[PDB]
Amino acid sequence: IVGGYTCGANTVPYQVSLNSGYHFCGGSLINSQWVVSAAHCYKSGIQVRLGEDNINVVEGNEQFISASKSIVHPSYNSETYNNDIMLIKLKSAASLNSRVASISLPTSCASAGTQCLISGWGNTKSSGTSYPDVLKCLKAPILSDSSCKSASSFIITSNMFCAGYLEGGKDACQGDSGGPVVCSGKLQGIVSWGEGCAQKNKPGIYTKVCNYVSWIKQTIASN
Ligand SMILES: N=C(N)c1cccc(-c2nocc2C(=O)Nc2ccc(-c3ccccc3S(N)(=O)=O)cc2)c1
Numbered sequence: 001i002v003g004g005y006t007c008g009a010n011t012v013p014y015q016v017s018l019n020s021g022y023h024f025c026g027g028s029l030i031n032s033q034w035v036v037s038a039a040h041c042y043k044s045g046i047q048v049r050l051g052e053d054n055i056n057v058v059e060g061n062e063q064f065i066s067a068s069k070s071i072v073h074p075s076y077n078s079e080t081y082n083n084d085i086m087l088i089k090l091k092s093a094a095s096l097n098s099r100v101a102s103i104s105l106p107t108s109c110a111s112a113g114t115q116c117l118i119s120g121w122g123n124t125k126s127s128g129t130s131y132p133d134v135l136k137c138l139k140a141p142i143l144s145d146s147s148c149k150s151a152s153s154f155i156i157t158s159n160m161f162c163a164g165y166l167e168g169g170k171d172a173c174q175g176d177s178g179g180p181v182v183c184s185g186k187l188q189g190i191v192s193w194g195e196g197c198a199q200k201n202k203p204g205i206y207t208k209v210c211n212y213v214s215w216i217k218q219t220i221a222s223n
Pocket residue numbers: 078079080081154155171172173174175176177191192193194195196197198203204205
């Protein structure tokens with residue numbers, strides 16, 4: 001997160017960190033046994049870390065649970081980034097509490113202009129590198145489709161939306177990938193990609209979760 005602020009411990013209780021000896025992607029807890037993340041974060045032997053704030057210190061409230069299945073969307077295209085969504089099943093159901101809680105799937109898509117919360121432990125610099133210890137947050141508005149496409153050097157599919165600030169300085173970034181965009185208490189986005197981070201006229205691009213609700217429910221029910 002570039003140009004954001006320190007969330008405060010466990011103020012984003014659905015935010016999880018994907019770990020393979022180190023943090024590498026975020027994810028969102030959607031029920032006691034399932035996590036929504038990004039297809040491009042796929043890796044085998046993922047450990048899910050829930051209830052995290054400072055990812056480098058054991059503070060308490062953590063739960064570490066191995067991924068038992070990582071289900072990349074069958075139509076995920078690593079070129080075009082279309083369908084950048086992955087479902088992770090935890091080996092064990094998480095113990096849900098005030099600091100480890102699920103976030104609701106949307107019932108309808110979010111609308112342009114709505115301010116949403118984006119969070120993660122990714123890069124906090126637009127040029128250069130600094131990774132935080134504690135969870136960072138950013139409130140950013142969903143941008144219209146036409147300004148998105150006007151800004152982007154790459155094709156924006158109907159499964160993506162732009163959110164953030166065209167003047168630069170405020171954006172998600174590497175390491176936030178797979179993490180949540182929550183608008184009015186609903187998981188509407190997944191940190192997917194962007195042209196660098198926090199550059200002028202180059203907003204963050206996010207997977208449009210509301211397109212996947214039926215797929216998410218069906219997949220979960222058959223696994
Ligand atoms: N600014 C962000 N919100 C953000 C979030 C996560 C990662 C990065 C990021 N930080 O550094 C690089 C990055 C990056 O995502 N690069 C990138 C650019 C374009 C595409 C892409 C999009 C659509 C179609 C095709 C492509 S592709 N694969 O041909 O380039 C994919 C990745 C930035």
